[model samples]
Target: METASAATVFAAGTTTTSVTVHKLLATDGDMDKIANELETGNYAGNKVGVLPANAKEIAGVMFVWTNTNNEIIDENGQTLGVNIDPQTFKLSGAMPATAMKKLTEAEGAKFNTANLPAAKYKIYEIHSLSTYVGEDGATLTGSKAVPIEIELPLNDVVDAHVYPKNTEAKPKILE
Candidate 1:
């Protein structure tokens, strides 16, 4: 006896993910000008140079980490790699970050990375950002470009575009 034929289909998918970072900066003088721009919702028309042209020129380092020490593993298990921990040789697991990159002009004052694996990563920046000195002496300064969390291949997502939130170093000056 002959067996019936069977129809089998194999499903497959493939794509890539990319993240871009854009820097927004302004001087105290221009910060004051933004008062009318952002408040009145006319920065586009006013264009007081809120977005710094010397963004990529700013000296700094950007690091990419698989995840924070506290988020992924315990100090016990962490004690093996580059040891960026505190006290004692501090060589736990490693320095945490597996890769690094810098902001450059190729992006017109931004940095972008593609072909990332299917894992959550943290992006951080180490730089000397400008300070906002309000009229009342209240100042605001950002030590790090807001931390970013990104997960790759999310629900068949190929290209992912992300940017950190400018929470502290806003263009609006304290009037």
Candidate 2:
């Protein structure tokens, strides 16, 4: 993964903020399996064993917003957004503001903003992705009863601000 030029920050009431992402590629081991399956057609439909060479690239992106307490405040679930392209790994999207507002409000409640206001927030980007390998009847591979699970890296971090009610604007990119 490559470093992004800048990261967008979301203010309490900010509605839309842009995000851009670059490339994604299969790990060497996974690539090898993909190649083997393509040539031998050995692993298809199999779920539990070795990955099939026929696996195809699957890609997506996610945004996670958290308050000072490190609690996730994003309403879009774990995956805040998806990438525009799965194969090429070009990802871009506007983060919705509803979640940011909710988080800010929650923070206000926690700290009694009327007395002591919150200052900033944190955001993270997750490069969500996967590869699919199916069973080819000719091979000994069995049907994939479940999807494979792998750990993905968390990339990009942005610091955001908490604006006064109804006055929030988009946050500026940092670093």
Candidate 3:
């Protein structure tokens, strides 16, 4: 798999944080499909396609954030979410203040009841079958399957930072 490095910076109230992410490139056709799915919010189920010999067919990357106790938190410190650039395959985003606050409070809790102010996240490459499943649970017998390839990195990090309060932040595509 082809791998690339990406960096993103965010500023909240008095804090600015930067993150380094890994980018994984996918087969040309799969890349287009991924972009469409993200834009329309309609994910295609398992679909059969021709993948390059020895290629890895990665569905997507899952980002999981955990508090000091190593407990998983929501995307905003509450759901698991996909964090990637459909266009460039880069993962980038800002940590929400509320979530950051929860982490901070967790760090100082008497019984480790709250989430930590600083958190750790992990990224995983999702792999799945290429065959498409119909709504009725049958496979698409006559669907055209194409071959594709996806490159993945050996190492990735789910790093987070809290900016000052009331800071505006958004996810971006890595260059």
Tens digits of per-residue lDDT for model 2 on 21-95? Answer: 211123322444444443463222112233344332222323344444333444322333432232232335554
lDDT of 1 at 99: 36
Number of the top candidate by TM-score?
A: 1
lDDT of each: 0.35, 0.28, 0.27
Looking at candidate 2, the ten consecutive residues that score lowest on lDDT are 144-153
Is candidate 1 or 2 superior in TM-score? 1
lDDT by residue (86-118, candidate 3, tens digit) is 224333454333321121122111112122233
Q: TM-scores of all models?
A: 0.38, 0.20, 0.20
Off by over 4 Å in 2: 1-17, 21-26, 29-58, 74-121, 124-175
lDDT of 1 at 61: 31
When 1 and 2 are scored with lDDT, the better candidate is: 1
Candidate 2 lDDT at 37 equals: 41
Please identify which of the two predictions, 2 or 3, would achieve the higher lDDT against the true structure. 2
- Best-to-worst ranking by lDDT: 1, 2, 3
Return the TM-score for candidate 2, rounded to 2 decimals: 0.20
1 versus 3: better lDDT goes to: 1
